[PDB]
Each structure stands twice: as structure tokens, then as C-alpha cells.
Design an enzyme around this catalytic site. Structure first.
Site, mmCIF file in Angstrom:
data_model
loop_
_atom_site.group_PDB
_atom_site.id
_atom_site.type_symbol
_atom_site.label_atom_id
_atom_site.label_comp_id
_atom_site.label_asym_id
_atom_site.label_seq_id
_atom_site.Cartn_x
_atom_site.Cartn_y
_atom_site.Cartn_z
ATOM 1 N N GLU A 73 -6.995 -4.322 -6.192
ATOM 2 C CA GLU A 73 -8.368 -4.468 -5.726
ATOM 3 C C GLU A 73 -8.402 -5.557 -4.667
ATOM 4 O O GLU A 73 -8.027 -6.702 -4.940
ATOM 5 C CB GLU A 73 -9.316 -4.812 -6.877
ATOM 6 C CG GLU A 73 -10.759 -5.000 -6.444
ATOM 7 C CD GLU A 73 -11.620 -5.573 -7.547
ATOM 8 O OE1 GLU A 73 -11.057 -6.014 -8.570
ATOM 9 O OE2 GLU A 73 -12.859 -5.584 -7.390
ATOM 10 N N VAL A 121 -10.867 -0.347 -4.471
ATOM 11 C CA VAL A 121 -10.253 -0.254 -5.792
ATOM 12 C C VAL A 121 -9.291 0.926 -5.755
ATOM 13 O O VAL A 121 -9.726 2.082 -5.703
ATOM 14 C CB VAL A 121 -11.287 -0.078 -6.914
ATOM 15 C CG1 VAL A 121 -10.740 -0.618 -8.229
ATOM 16 C CG2 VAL A 121 -12.604 -0.752 -6.552
ATOM 17 N N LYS A 176 -8.502 5.697 -3.949
ATOM 18 C CA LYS A 176 -9.360 4.572 -3.604
ATOM 19 C C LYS A 176 -10.796 4.933 -3.963
ATOM 20 O O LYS A 176 -11.367 5.871 -3.395
ATOM 21 C CB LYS A 176 -9.245 4.208 -2.124
ATOM 22 C CG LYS A 176 -10.182 3.082 -1.708
ATOM 23 C CD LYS A 176 -9.613 2.261 -0.561
ATOM 24 C CE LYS A 176 -9.427 3.096 0.692
ATOM 25 N NZ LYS A 176 -8.940 2.266 1.829
ATOM 26 N N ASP A 229 5.322 -1.845 -1.647
ATOM 27 C CA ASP A 229 5.088 -2.349 -0.303
ATOM 28 C C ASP A 229 6.288 -3.167 0.164
ATOM 29 O O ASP A 229 7.170 -3.530 -0.617
ATOM 30 C CB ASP A 229 3.797 -3.178 -0.241
ATOM 31 C CG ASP A 229 3.831 -4.414 -1.131
ATOM 32 O OD1 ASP A 229 4.854 -4.666 -1.802
ATOM 33 O OD2 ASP A 229 2.815 -5.140 -1.160
ATOM 34 N N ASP A 288 -3.942 -4.991 11.608
ATOM 35 C CA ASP A 288 -3.689 -5.687 10.348
ATOM 36 C C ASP A 288 -2.292 -5.340 9.841
ATOM 37 O O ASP A 288 -2.090 -5.022 8.668
ATOM 38 C CB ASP A 288 -4.756 -5.352 9.306
ATOM 39 C CG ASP A 288 -4.883 -6.426 8.235
ATOM 40 O OD1 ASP A 288 -4.427 -7.566 8.475
ATOM 41 O OD2 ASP A 288 -5.434 -6.134 7.153
ATOM 42 N N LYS A 306 0.839 -6.223 8.343
ATOM 43 C CA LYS A 306 1.470 -7.240 7.520
ATOM 44 C C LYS A 306 2.328 -6.531 6.488
ATOM 45 O O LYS A 306 2.116 -5.343 6.212
ATOM 46 C CB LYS A 306 0.431 -8.146 6.842
ATOM 47 C CG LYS A 306 -0.656 -7.410 6.076
ATOM 48 C CD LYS A 306 -1.685 -8.386 5.524
ATOM 49 C CE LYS A 306 -2.795 -7.662 4.777
ATOM 50 N NZ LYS A 306 -3.773 -8.611 4.173
ATOM 51 N N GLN A 332 2.318 -6.469 3.384
ATOM 52 C CA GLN A 332 1.547 -5.878 2.296
ATOM 53 C C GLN A 332 0.976 -4.513 2.659
ATOM 54 O O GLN A 332 0.658 -3.732 1.757
ATOM 55 C CB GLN A 332 0.409 -6.811 1.877
ATOM 56 C CG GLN A 332 0.861 -8.158 1.337
ATOM 57 C CD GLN A 332 0.913 -9.232 2.407
ATOM 58 O OE1 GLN A 332 1.485 -9.032 3.479
ATOM 59 N NE2 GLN A 332 0.307 -10.377 2.121
ATOM 60 N N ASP A 361 -3.457 1.156 5.107
ATOM 61 C CA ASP A 361 -4.673 0.361 5.245
ATOM 62 C C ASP A 361 -5.158 0.322 6.690
ATOM 63 O O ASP A 361 -4.842 -0.612 7.435
ATOM 64 C CB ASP A 361 -4.460 -1.061 4.717
ATOM 65 C CG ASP A 361 -5.768 -1.778 4.431
ATOM 66 O OD1 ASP A 361 -6.840 -1.203 4.719
ATOM 67 O OD2 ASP A 361 -5.727 -2.912 3.910
HETATM 68 C C1 LIG Z 1 0.653 -1.528 -10.207
HETATM 69 O O1 LIG Z 1 1.693 -0.686 -9.714
HETATM 70 C C2 LIG Z 1 1.814 -0.502 -8.342
HETATM 71 C C3 LIG Z 1 2.143 0.733 -7.760
HETATM 72 C C4 LIG Z 1 2.255 0.876 -6.357
HETATM 73 C C5 LIG Z 1 2.045 -0.191 -5.448
HETATM 74 C C6 LIG Z 1 2.162 -0.064 -3.880
HETATM 75 C C7 LIG Z 1 1.106 0.899 -3.118
HETATM 76 O O2 LIG Z 1 0.153 0.327 -2.644
HETATM 77 N N1 LIG Z 1 1.206 2.346 -2.955
HETATM 78 C C8 LIG Z 1 0.264 3.255 -2.257
HETATM 79 C C9 LIG Z 1 -1.048 2.924 -1.715
HETATM 80 C C10 LIG Z 1 -1.614 4.063 -1.128
HETATM 81 C C11 LIG Z 1 -2.964 4.237 -0.428
HETATM 82 C C12 LIG Z 1 -4.165 3.500 -1.089
HETATM 83 C C13 LIG Z 1 -5.039 2.939 0.028
HETATM 84 C C14 LIG Z 1 -4.062 2.639 1.189
HETATM 85 O O3 LIG Z 1 -3.460 1.347 1.106
HETATM 86 C C15 LIG Z 1 -4.349 0.256 1.257
HETATM 87 O O4 LIG Z 1 -5.304 0.375 1.976
HETATM 88 N N2 LIG Z 1 -4.006 -0.902 0.513
HETATM 89 C C16 LIG Z 1 -2.664 -1.012 -0.166
HETATM 90 C C17 LIG Z 1 -1.608 -1.579 0.824
HETATM 91 C C18 LIG Z 1 -2.731 -1.904 -1.440
HETATM 92 C C19 LIG Z 1 -2.963 3.748 1.029
HETATM 93 N N3 LIG Z 1 -0.646 5.050 -1.320
HETATM 94 N N4 LIG Z 1 0.469 4.593 -1.982
HETATM 95 C C20 LIG Z 1 1.715 -1.410 -6.070
HETATM 96 C C21 LIG Z 1 1.598 -1.580 -7.466
#
Ligand code: A1CAI
Lengths: 274, 298
Positions: B12, B17, B33, B86, B127, B129, B131, B145
Site C-alpha cells: 500500500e 492497494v 490494484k 522488484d 519515477d 526507481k 522499487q 507504476d
Molecule cells: C508480499 O509479497 C510480494 C509479492 C510481490 C512483490 C513485487 C510486485 O510488486 N509485483 C507486481 C506488481 C504489479 C502491478 C501492481 C501495480 C503496479 O506496480 C505499482 O504501481 N507499484 C508496485 C511497484 C508496488 C504493477 N504486478 N506485479 C512484492 C511483495
């Protein structure tokens, strides 16, 4: 042809091809009102002209208005049978979506409901914006009519540096061509021609076919049908003259030309007929 | 909105979310999301409308795909492609052993491909980075993102100031430039490039002035010769201390000759001279990963 010079950040023919290929994704129907038998073409002009005045009051950019215009026309092409009392809600909600996309600090929701004289509540606008965006398949990034004029003005004033991203062109002649396009967009028959053609045809009436072809890449034969259609609109602007560049408090003078204006062009549109 | 079961919360933040969901019938996993519209007084957030419209036209193997946009109840669900980690977690996990150089080169090459695709479509990410860079178990890395992204016109106009996270913010933004475009993403990627090599952030500043001075201490305090017009920028001060440019043999020790050359061009002070994503792909640093396509010289 491609009028863009050699681009340092990408292939010049690639950037132009993507811009052209995008217009194949965004479709326009010059007779979408046949799907709404109760509506008339003049109603669309009154609504768009009202949205122009709303943009000038809140000093919204010209891109914001033409975004709302394109959202309105494409949403109607997906709907059937609309009453005139529903037009204001669809129009102001299109401007609400457009303002949040383009403006850095857009107006709040209640301000968009305030200008409707109570005919549109805040919850009605939020309901309408979701129906508009879902019906448009969330395709909310078109190349507006005014966006093409911005491209054509930069290429007309290119130097040896070939820097096409830094804006450099006279602001006063820009608002004169946009004044012609603001009139032509009120007529629903403009959708017959692509947005890039309309902007190039307006530039031609204030310049020449050589400058038009240099900055737009389109041959004279491509815009001749559009120029001949734009013929009555161009003279009505020529009969009354062109407007001056305005100043807006809080807006820098290097960006004053990008602010949407509105003059009483209602009778200017009917003079173009016949 | 069914056939999808939430498995774990991914995070989050400014995005919203994010949950990890899995299809029970097909075994397909996605990233959801969730946007609760009842709490949004201005309707769908501007960052949400921007990201959806941009991603539905940015289909590329190195860009995280937006699969669907579902409007259920008073909520808005954005279905994304799922990636397991990431880049920041991968760099931290690899901090002791170090990321192998072929994997660093492969990741940077893919990042430049996704970035060149964004810029050719006239889109700034703004943006970049670690992350926001996601990797899978098949050697791929993807841009994610796009909430802070914006399509730029030709020519551009004055856009939102103070963009990009501080550690990866280009010096022209820190000095208050009126206009900016694709060069700001290249700077961020150059910072990420060096961070993969050294396992440490290149310019870890805690304020805008400290961020600028950390850049000055490494690349030298710029002047009109190396960056025409720098002394006329709004946030420029003649009282900036004069630091000498450090040899990249000490900034990025493990980097070879071709690597230091590419990094130098990605960290050029002048945004007009800073190397483009397309040109970076043609750099001899990737001479073994890719081969030049025959160019029609017409
Ligand atoms: C608790 O266990 C975990 C499992 C996997 C992760 C890594 C991850 O984020 N995978 C995604 C994200 C995504 C999409 C969700 C919205 C977009 O990303 C963002 O806008 N914000 C992100 C960078 C946070 C793309 N598709 N695949 C972290 C923890």
C-alpha cells in the site's frame, strides 16, 4: 510524408508513425447524431461553445477543451437515443475527465457542478464520468485538433538546432489559427476529416500550401476537400478580423496562448452555412 | 469480478492497494490494484485515469501490462501482470555476492528498450526507481507504476515541477528548469545502472540541496561550458562549492571502458547532450547482446 526533423530521442519516422497510427485507433463519425434521432447538430454547437466559455473562466488549456470535445463525440458514437437535458451532464463530465488529465491543479468537482446552475450534481458528474470512460474503453489519450496545431507551429519555426521539444513560435498567430479551428469544431461535419487534416487546413488559410506541406507532410490533394469545406469558416473569420493575445493573471506570458478563450461566435457559425 | 481469489497483499503506497490474486480455474496469478471510490471525493483519481489510458496504449514486453479495468460496486479494480519481486529487493539480496555483470547488462538493455518505447510514444515515466522495476523468474525486467507518468506534446510545455524520487532526480529538475522531457528518465536509469554495479545508491541525498551537492561532488560542479545556461537557472547559486569531477574508475570500479562511457553519457549535465534511450541501445556496451539492424539510408 513526415515533417519532423531528425529526433535525438527516437527515430523521426517512428515517432510520426505512432502519431499517425494512433488516429487509426480513435474513430470519429460525422453522422453519429443519426443514432440519436431526437438531437440536432446545432445542440452540439451550443454545448461545445458553452464548454469553451467554462474553460476561459477557469483558465483551462485549449487541450483540455478539445479533449472534452473528442470524449463527447466518441462517447455519442457508442450510445443511442439521448435527450437534450442529458447533453449538459455528458459535456461537463467530459470536461471533468479532461481537466484531471491535463491540468496540473484542476478545479474541484463542486466547481464543475457549480457552473451547471444546479442542473448537474456532484454525484451525477461522478456517475457520468465512469460511464464515459468505460464506454470509451478507457481510450482517453487522443491527438486533439489543437495538439496538431502545436506540432505544425513548431516545425514552421525550426532552426539549425532542430529542437522540436522546446516551444518557439509567435503566440499571436497561434491563437488566430486556433480561433478558426474553434469555429469549425462547432460544425459536426468536421469529423469527416481527420484532426490532423483540420489543423493543417486552418494553417493553410493563414499561410500557404508550401508552408502547410512543410510542417504537416500532407499534400495539397489531401486537404483540398477539407480546405473547400473550411472555405466559408475562414472568410467569416477574415471578415471580422483576428483577435489579440490575452493576458491571464496567474498564467505566465510564455503560456498565455495555450489558455482557451471564447468570443460570441454563435452567429459566426450560421454565416458559414450557404 | 469473480474467479479471482486474493492470495497476499503486495503493498500500500502512492499507487494504492495492491493484492496478489490467483485464478482458481486457470491457475493464472495477477496483481490487483483496488481503488475504493467511496473515499474519493473527486471521483477516479487523476493518477488513475492517466495510468490506465497510458498503459492501454503502451503494450511492450518490458512494461508491466494492464490486463483489465473492472468497475464493481463502489470500487475500481485494475488487473496487472504479476511479477514476483522488484529490483530493490534483488539488489539487496545480491548485495554480498554482487549481481553478475551479464545480468546487469541484460537488465539495463531491457530497461532501455522499455524506456525507448515509452519515449517514442511520447510518454515520460518520471519515477524510475528500483522499487518500480519488477523482475520475473525468466530473466526479464519491466517498468511499473505509471501513476506519475505523463504524455508530452511536440513541443512540450511547462509540466509538474519537483517530479521523480529525490535520489534519482535529474539535476535540471533540482535547479528548477522550466521545460523538461525524456532526459529525466535517462538520468534515473543511469543512477540505477551505477547502483547495480556498486550495490549502493549513487546519490543518496536527504534534501534538494544535499542531493544537488552529492551530484556535484561526483560529477563536478557544472559551468556554462559543460552545461550552457546552468548559471541562469532559477535555483542556481554562484556560491555553490567547486568540486572536481571524480574518475569513474573509483565511482564504478567494476565497470569496464564501455561501461564507464555509457554511464558518463547517461549522467551528462546538459539534458540536450544526455544520451537517449535509443542511442544507448546502440552503445558498444551492448555490442555482444545485440547486433545492428541494416538501416535504409534513403
Ligand atoms: C508480499 O509479497 C510480494 C509479492 C510481490 C512483490 C513485487 C510486485 O510488486 N509485483 C507486481 C506488481 C504489479 C502491478 C501492481 C501495480 C503496479 O506496480 C505499482 O504501481 N507499484 C508496485 C511497484 C508496488 C504493477 N504486478 N506485479 C512484492 C511483495
Amino acid at each position: 510524408g513526415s515533417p519532423l526533423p531528425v529526433l535525438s530521442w527516437a527515430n523521426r519516422e517512428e515517432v510520426w508513425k505512432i502519431m499517425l497510427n494512433k488516429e487509426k485507433t480513435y474513430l470519429r463519425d460525422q453522422h453519429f447524431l443519426e443514432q440519436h434521432p431526437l438531437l440536432q447538430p446545432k445542440m452540439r454547437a451550443i454545448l461545445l461553445d458553452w464548454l469553451m466559455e467554462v474553460c476561459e473562466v477557469y483558465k483551462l488549456h485549449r487541450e483540455t477543451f478539445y479533449l472534452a470535445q473528442d470524449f463527447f463525440d466518441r462517447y455519442m458514437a457508442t450510445q443511442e437515443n439521448v435527450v437534450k437535458t442529458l447533453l449538459q451532464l455528458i459535456g461537463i463530465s467530459s470536461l471533468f475527465i479532461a481537466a484531471k488529465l491535463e491540468e496540473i491543479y484542476p478545479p474541484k468537482l463542486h466547481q464543475f457542478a457549480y457552473v451547471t446552475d444546479g442542473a448537474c450534481s456532484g454525484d451525477e458528474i461522478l456517475t457520468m464520468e465512469l460511464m464515459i470512460m468505460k464506454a470509451l474503453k478507457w481510450r482517453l489519450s487522443p491527438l486533439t485538433i489543437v495538439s496538431w496545431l502545436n506540432v505544425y507551429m513548431q516545425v514552421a519555426y525550426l532552426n539549425d538546432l532542430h529542437e522540436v521539444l522546446l516551444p518557439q513560435y509567435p503566440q499571436q498567430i497561434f491563437i488566430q489559427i486556433a480561433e478558426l479551428l474553434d469555429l469549425c469544431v462547432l460544425d459536426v461535419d468536421c469529423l469527416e476529416f481527420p484532426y490532423g487534416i483540420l489543423a493543417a487546413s486552418a494553417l493553410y488559410h493563414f499561410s500557404s500550401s508550401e508552408l502547410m506541406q512543410k510542417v504537416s507532410g500532407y499534400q495539397w490533394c489531401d486537404i483540398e476537400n477539407c480546405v473547400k469545406w473550411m472555405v466559408p469558416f475562414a472568410m467569416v473569420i477574415r471578415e471580422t478580423g483576428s483577435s489579440k493575445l490575452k493576458h491571464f493573471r496567474g498564467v505566465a506570458d510564455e503560456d498565455a496562448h495555450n489558455i482557451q478563450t471564447h468570443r460570441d461566435s454563435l452567429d459566426l457559425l450560421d454565416k458559414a452555412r450557404a | 469480478m469473480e474467479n479471482f481469489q486474493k492470495v497476499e497483499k503486495i503493498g500500500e503506497g502512492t499507487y494504492g492497494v495492491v493484492y496478489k490474486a490467483r485464478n482458481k480455474l486457470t491457475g493464472e496469478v495477477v496483481a490487483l490494484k483496488k481503488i475504493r471510490l467511496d473515499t474519493e471525493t473527486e471521483g477516479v483519481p487523476s493518477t488513475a485515469i492517466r495510468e490506465i489510458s497510458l498503459l492501454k496504449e503502451l503494450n511492450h514486453p518490458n512494461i508491466v501490462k494492464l490486463l483489465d479495468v473492472i468497475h464493481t460496486e463502489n470500487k475500481l479494480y485494475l488487473v496487472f501482470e504479476f511479477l514476483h519481486q522488484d529490483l530493490k529487493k534483488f539488489m539487496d539480496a545480491s548485495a554480498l555476492t554482487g549481481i553478475p555483470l551479464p545480468l546487469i547488462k541484460s537488465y539495463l538493455f531491457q530497461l532501455l528498450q522499455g524506456l525507448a518505447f515509452c519515449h517514442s510514444h511520447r510518454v515520460l515515466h518520471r519515477d524510475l526507481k528500483p522499487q518500480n522495476l519488477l523482475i520475473n523468474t525468466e530473466g526479464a525486467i519491466k517498468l511499473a507504476d505509471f501513476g506519475l507518468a505523463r504524455a508530452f506534446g511536440v513541443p512540450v510545455r511547462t509540466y509538474t515541477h519537483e517530479v521523480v524520487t529525490l535520489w534519482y532526480r535529474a539535476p535540471e529538475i533540482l535547479l528548477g528548469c522550466k521545460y523538461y522531457s525524456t532526459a529525466v528518465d535517462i538520468w534515473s536509469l543511469g543512477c540505477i545502472f551505477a547502483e547495480m554495479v556498486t550495490r549502493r545508491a549513487l546519490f543518496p541525498g536527504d534534501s534538494e540541496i544535499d542531493q544537488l551537492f552529492r551530484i556535484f561532488r561526483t560529477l563536478g560542479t557544472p559551468d556554462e561550458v559543460v552545461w550552457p545556461g546552468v548559471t541562469s537557472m532559477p535555483d542556481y547559486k554562484p556560491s555553490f562549492p567547486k568540486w572536481a569531477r571524480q574518475d569513474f574508475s573509483k565511482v564504478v570500479p567494476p565497470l569496464d571502458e564501455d561501461g564507464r562511457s555509457l554511464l558518463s553519457q547517461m549522467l551528462h549535465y546538459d539534458p540536450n547532450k544526455r544520451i537517449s534511450a535509443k542511442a544507448a541501445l546502440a552503445h558498444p556496451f551492448f555490442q555482444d547482446v545485440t547486433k545492428p539492424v541494416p538501416h535504409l539510408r534513403l
